Protein backbone atom coordinates (compact mmCIF):
# COMPACT_ATOMS: atom_id res chain seq x y z
CA UNK A 1 0.00 0.00 0.00
CA UNK A 2 1.34 3.40 -1.05
CA UNK A 3 0.55 6.92 0.10
CA UNK A 4 -0.21 9.56 -2.53
CA UNK A 5 2.25 12.50 -2.04
CA UNK A 6 0.68 15.72 -0.60
CA UNK A 7 3.54 17.76 -2.14
CA UNK A 8 5.47 18.07 -5.43
CA UNK A 9 2.51 16.66 -7.39
CA UNK A 10 1.09 19.86 -8.87
CA UNK A 11 -1.11 19.27 -11.93
CA UNK A 12 -1.99 21.07 -15.16
CA UNK A 13 -5.32 19.47 -16.08
CA UNK A 14 -5.83 17.08 -19.03
CA UNK A 15 -3.07 14.45 -19.44
CA UNK A 16 -1.00 15.64 -16.45
CA UNK A 17 -1.53 12.36 -14.54
CA UNK A 18 0.23 10.41 -17.31
CA UNK A 19 4.03 10.22 -17.78
CA UNK A 20 5.51 13.22 -19.62
CA UNK A 21 4.52 13.05 -23.29
CA UNK A 22 7.34 12.03 -25.63
CA UNK A 23 7.87 14.28 -28.66
CA UNK A 24 6.07 11.60 -30.72
CA UNK A 25 3.02 11.56 -28.43
CA UNK A 26 3.04 15.36 -28.24
CA UNK A 27 2.90 15.34 -32.05
CA UNK A 28 -0.03 12.87 -32.12
CA UNK A 29 -2.06 15.15 -29.86
CA UNK A 30 -1.53 18.11 -32.22
CA UNK A 31 -2.68 15.97 -35.17
CA UNK A 32 -5.95 15.23 -33.34
CA UNK A 33 -6.64 18.99 -33.28
CA UNK A 34 -5.88 19.36 -36.98
CA UNK A 35 -7.94 16.29 -37.96
CA UNK A 36 -10.96 17.80 -36.22
CA UNK A 37 -10.43 21.23 -37.73
CA UNK A 38 -9.38 22.85 -34.46
CA UNK A 39 -7.12 25.92 -34.48
CA UNK A 40 -3.98 25.33 -32.39
CA UNK A 41 -2.53 28.04 -30.17
CA UNK A 42 0.24 28.21 -27.59
CA UNK A 43 0.13 29.82 -24.17
CA UNK A 44 2.89 30.25 -21.61
CA UNK A 45 3.26 31.56 -18.05
CA UNK A 46 6.34 32.52 -16.03
CA UNK A 47 5.01 33.56 -12.60
CA UNK A 48 1.73 31.95 -11.47
CA UNK A 49 1.58 28.39 -12.76
CA UNK A 50 -1.52 27.56 -10.72
CA UNK A 51 -4.78 29.34 -9.88
CA UNK A 52 -5.05 31.56 -6.78
CA UNK A 53 -7.54 34.16 -5.45
CA UNK A 54 -6.08 37.58 -4.76
CA UNK A 55 -8.49 40.11 -6.29
CA UNK A 56 -11.82 38.58 -5.39
CA UNK A 57 -13.23 35.41 -3.78
CA UNK A 58 -16.82 35.46 -5.07
CA UNK A 59 -18.19 32.25 -6.69
CA UNK A 60 -16.51 31.39 -9.98
CA UNK A 61 -13.73 33.94 -9.61
CA UNK A 62 -10.08 32.84 -9.62
CA UNK A 63 -6.91 34.60 -10.69
CA UNK A 64 -4.37 32.66 -12.76
CA UNK A 65 -6.72 31.08 -15.30
CA UNK A 66 -5.48 33.28 -18.14
CA UNK A 67 -1.94 32.72 -19.40
CA UNK A 68 -0.12 34.83 -22.00
CA UNK A 69 -0.55 33.98 -25.69
CA UNK A 70 2.49 32.90 -27.71
CA UNK A 71 2.16 34.82 -30.97
CA UNK A 72 -1.23 34.11 -32.60
CA UNK A 73 -3.67 31.21 -33.11
CA UNK A 74 -2.34 29.11 -35.99
CA UNK A 75 -5.18 29.38 -38.51
CA UNK A 76 -4.76 27.39 -41.71
CA UNK A 77 -2.00 25.30 -40.13
CA UNK A 78 -1.89 21.88 -41.81
CA UNK A 79 1.44 20.53 -40.55
CA UNK A 80 1.63 19.46 -36.89
CA UNK A 81 5.41 19.99 -37.02
CA UNK A 82 4.93 23.75 -37.37
CA UNK A 83 3.20 23.68 -33.97
CA UNK A 84 5.90 21.48 -32.40
CA UNK A 85 8.51 23.93 -33.73
CA UNK A 86 6.93 26.82 -31.82
CA UNK A 87 7.12 24.91 -28.53
CA UNK A 88 10.90 24.56 -29.05
CA UNK A 89 11.21 28.27 -29.79
CA UNK A 90 9.06 29.20 -26.78
CA UNK A 91 11.06 27.16 -24.25
CA UNK A 92 14.23 28.47 -25.86
CA UNK A 93 13.15 32.05 -25.06
CA UNK A 94 11.52 31.20 -21.72
CA UNK A 95 13.05 28.03 -20.20
CA UNK A 96 11.56 28.82 -16.77
CA UNK A 97 8.02 28.97 -18.19
CA UNK A 98 5.16 26.48 -18.31
CA UNK A 99 3.92 26.06 -21.88
CA UNK A 100 0.62 24.55 -23.01
CA UNK A 101 -1.12 23.93 -26.32
CA UNK A 102 -4.79 24.88 -26.60
CA UNK A 103 -7.30 24.23 -29.36
CA UNK A 104 -10.25 26.30 -30.53
CA UNK A 105 -13.48 25.04 -32.02
CA UNK A 106 -15.54 27.83 -34.59
CA UNK A 107 -18.95 26.15 -34.51
CA UNK A 108 -18.70 26.97 -31.11
CA UNK A 109 -16.41 29.85 -30.22
CA UNK A 110 -14.78 27.43 -27.82
CA UNK A 111 -11.92 26.24 -26.52
CA UNK A 112 -11.92 22.42 -26.50
CA UNK A 113 -8.32 21.34 -25.89
CA UNK A 114 -5.67 22.22 -23.32
CA UNK A 115 -2.64 20.14 -22.36
CA UNK A 116 0.79 20.96 -20.96
CA UNK A 117 3.69 20.70 -23.45
CA UNK A 118 6.60 21.91 -21.30
CA UNK A 119 7.21 22.38 -17.56
CA UNK A 120 10.16 24.25 -15.94
CA UNK A 121 12.87 22.56 -13.86
CA UNK A 122 11.54 20.84 -10.74
CA UNK A 123 7.96 20.51 -11.98
Sign of CA dihedral 94, 67, 34, 22: positive
**Residue 93 interface partner, choices other proteins, a second copy, none, CB cut-off 5-8 Å depending on type:** a second copy
Query: How many C-beta atoms lie closer than 10 Å to residue 31's C-beta?
Result: 13
Q: Does 23 bind other proteins (CB under 8 A)?
A: no
Question: 22-61: which residues touch a second copy (CB under 8 A)?
Answer: 44-47, 53, 55, 57
| Residue 5, C-beta contacts closer than 8 angstroms, at least 6 positions apart | none
Which residue in 23, 37, 69, 95 binds other proteins (CB under 8 A)?
69
Q: Find all residues with CB under 8 Å of 17, minimum gap 6, and list them.
A: 11
Residue among 66 and 92 whose Cβ is closer to other proteins: 66
Interface with other proteins includes 93 (CB under 8 A)? no
Amino acid sequence: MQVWPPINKKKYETLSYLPDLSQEQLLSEVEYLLKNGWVPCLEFETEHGFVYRENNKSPGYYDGRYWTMWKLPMFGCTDATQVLAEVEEAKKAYPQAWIRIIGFDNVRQVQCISFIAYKPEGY
